[PDB]
Assembly symmetry: C2
Homo-oligomer: 156 residues x 2
């Protein structure tokens, strides 16, 4: 794929405007494609291990944010990046791989669940870094501020 047809989409929206900007529609298109792009790149570090995005997200969330006893399914969702129909069965699934366990509830990593994340984490941190490499200091800070500001507007 390329960004060679961005002007084609822009002019396509102009035709629709008989009687004045396509910025919003193009920005959301780009954000949508960015998400998919980021998705393919991030999964590379955990695909080989048989995990999908939703599974990975839960495990890493436990790894960085779960206290020794674990996180209540509520606070667990509040601390995870992904939330939605994608995580409709992530818990049950992970329990079945013995990567997490219960404590009634309360979820937390099992010795292997943690072993896996420890081994993958270096590769995740790398991809995470690489993926944002094209930008740079302050560019990444501003992106952070805007996404936060936009996201803040919708979280009301």
């Amino acid at each position: 794929d390329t960004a060679a047809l961005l002007e084609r989409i822009r002019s396509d929206w102009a035709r629709l405007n008989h009687g004045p900007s396509a910025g919003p529609m193009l920005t959301l298109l780009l954000l949508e494609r960015l998400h998919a792009a980021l998705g393919r790149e991030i999964e590379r570090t955990y695909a080989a291990s048989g995990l999908n995005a939703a599974g990975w997200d839960l495990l890493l969330t436990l790894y960085r944010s779960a206290p020794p006893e674990g996180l209540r399914p509520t606070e667990l969702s509040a601390l995870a990046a992904i939330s939605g129909p994608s995580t409709s069965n992530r818990i049950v699934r992970l329990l079945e791989k013995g990567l997490i366990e219960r404590r009634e509830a309360s979820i937390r990593l099992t010795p292997q669940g943690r072993a896996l994340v420890t081994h993958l984490l270096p590769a995740h941190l790398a991809t995470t870094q690489r993926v944002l490499a094209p930008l740079s200091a302050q560019e990444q800070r501003t992106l952070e501020e805007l996404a936060g500001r936009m996201l803040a507007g919708l979280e009301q």
Copy 2:
């Protein structure tokens, strides 16, 4: 949800750093949550009509970018915002609702498929605008530039 635990996640990553920035990980988290937020807001204009995101995207793509005969399944994906397992059966599904049709192939809207988009479009353009309202000129332009630049880095 709120952005009240962003510092908690940041400090959580710091603990992991025994021996130096969490920006990348927090920026991608924010981008991930932004996508879900945007997803819930955009669907409001088409949910009542029984369409999901993948169905809507195809229809709108045809509406703005399909010439009179239609788009070849290839160029159709190149002009659509969404691409992935979500659109694994969007075509077959839409044919079944009689919103699109064939031309052997080649896809295009049917009289109603177009009627629907015409009726929804005003509401979509509104949400699309609203959702980016919190920012402003140049803020939306810069967001566009960065997402494009990042996205450009991954589309290689």
